[PDB]
Amino acid sequence: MRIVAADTGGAVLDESFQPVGLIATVAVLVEKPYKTSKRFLVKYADPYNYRQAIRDEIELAIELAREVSPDVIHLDSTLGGIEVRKLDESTIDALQISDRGKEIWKELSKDLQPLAKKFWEETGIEIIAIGKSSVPVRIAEIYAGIFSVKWALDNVKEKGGLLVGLPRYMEVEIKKDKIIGKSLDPREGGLYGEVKTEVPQGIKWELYPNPLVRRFMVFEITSKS
Amino acid sequence: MRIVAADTGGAVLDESFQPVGLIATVAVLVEKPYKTSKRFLVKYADPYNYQAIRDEIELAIELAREVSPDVIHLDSTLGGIEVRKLDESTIDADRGKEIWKELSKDLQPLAKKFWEETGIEIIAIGKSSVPVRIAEIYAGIFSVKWALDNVKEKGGLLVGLPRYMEVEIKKDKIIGKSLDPREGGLYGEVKTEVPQGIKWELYPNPLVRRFMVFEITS
Amino acid sequence: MRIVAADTGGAVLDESFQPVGLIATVAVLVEKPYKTSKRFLVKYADPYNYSGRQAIRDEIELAIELAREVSPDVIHLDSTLGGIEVRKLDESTIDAKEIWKELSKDLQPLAKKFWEETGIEIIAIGKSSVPVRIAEIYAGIFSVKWALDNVKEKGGLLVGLPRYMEVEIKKDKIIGKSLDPREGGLYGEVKTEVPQGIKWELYPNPLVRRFMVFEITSKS
Ligand SMILES: [Mg+2]
Ligand SMILES: [Mg+2]
Ligand SMILES: [Mg+2]
């Protein structure tokens, strides 16, 4: 099975760990053995001017899918595997979720449903709201963490610093020519990602637990002085 | 403490990872340090034609008549109440209360007799029990053994393992381990014939996070 | 950020893994990089004489005591309530339960007085807090130190550890680590004299998945 998935992750935090805005939306193509992705796209938001996220996700997943022709698209909404092209107010009412959840997806339907309908009509490919059950979604999330770190390394102010809140229980490792992202949960079976980049000089970095949010890590960049 | 527990796990999957039916029910004897089992029984189902709790309680009782444990752990998370005490009244203390109210007809007296016979309680503990989890891991292990023994006649097989466990295939045995270090190093080991001219692989079920797939081909 | 947290943990188990009483209440000071604590306080309870109201009472005073020494930015209390400030804990905001209305009459004045002196909030954050988890691990460690220090001659002792943590015995030390790598490598360290004439082992509580047991047995 060949799967395209998307997710949004990585947040700029202030020095007191308060979220400021999200950084990266990533679409991935995942194939057997379903541990990583070698083909992916990134879209960067502006964290300092921050759901537009799920709109960027479905749009980016569709763009990648048009290139690689997967069997299915996985969307990060935990709905049971229902097709997005079939998401109307009635089918949402039949979903076992919160009333605000239903309210939220009724609003989103207006933008997502027509998009998935048109893509399906063109390809026969379904976009499914599978959410947290999906490994490709988790891999997308992992890549969003890596790309958020890459973004921070590329944009950190001279003599300045930057805190990036990573997606849940993942770590990044810095190499001279790339960033490696890995789930910290061995139960996931070894999910990981790698992205090439140039690591700049004059800065230090540190990965540590977000003291306010258990199982979430922070990647902090500080300037050398 | 010496414990017999039972569970059912391992599933045949189609090529699109959709489950077809369960494979193995396993009863285990577990003693200190409660990380593995050395004495165990297995009962296979017909996955292509798939109540597990009935086979679980029987296979547990069966092993118990051979090793005489202090207690039996049944896979039903009820906080530890004795099964022989499970009658419609005691049950009432929601869809679940309804289903347990059906099972209790055959199970309650079955455990009553056993307790009178042996002085051994059958407690409904489920998710809290380490022995139950050890039984589950072995069910995974035997599901792989089942797969090894059926692949030649089937050509290719996808086995869905129980949650977050891996298997490793060595010279004369299958080793299974929990992937969750929080469980404290739970593992199992089963000696078996490894047929030749096969290739196998372990990888994430892309549709079910934290579940692994054991794939074997000829 | 500098945070003082507290929690109670470590249990005495009987032969059949049944909890008897809790052992240690620990306040910890946690700073960057938020993996451990190098300054901490402990109060031992009497496990054989132990509802759970005393623990959070002992927790808040130990935290305040520690806070007066190290002056943190905030205090974390083990109670998951989204992070409400304890000094603002009365009927109207609690109602937004019957337990806390009993607790508030003691805790709220403590928090109010402390905030008045320092401006430091005591927040009911609970499980979201890393420093609370670090306090919990230290409770596990001090519980082992307690067991080592108090095991009878030719007697034994079962210590029920807090959730998914391990302890390692070293020559002059007890080390505690979380068994969940998702937490990012949280650990603790406590200096102590390890008694002779005793053996130990660490193994899964068979009745409580993901909880470990640390057992002391006397050599013969
Ligand atoms: Mg998402
Ligand atoms: Mg079961
Ligand atoms: Mg507590």
Residue numbers in the entry:
A (entry chain A): 1 to 50, 55 to 229
B (entry chain C): 1 to 50, 56 to 98, 103 to 227
C (entry chain B): 1 to 50, 53 to 98, 106 to 229
Task: Provide the publication's sentences verbatim.
Here, we report the crystal structures of PhoExo I, which shares 76% amino acid sequence identity with PfuExo I. In this study, we determined three substrate-free structures of PhoExo I and four structures of PhoExo I in complexes with ssDNAs. PhoExo I forms a trimer in solution similar to PfuExo I. The 3′-5′ exonuclease assay of PhoExo I showed that PhoExo I cleaved an ssDNA from its 3′-end at every two nucleotides, and the cleavage stopped at the third to fifth nucleotide from the 5′-end. PhoExo I is predicted to utilize a DEDE (RNase HIII)-type catalytic motif for the hydrolysis of ssDNA. PhoExo I is a novel RNase H superfamily protein.
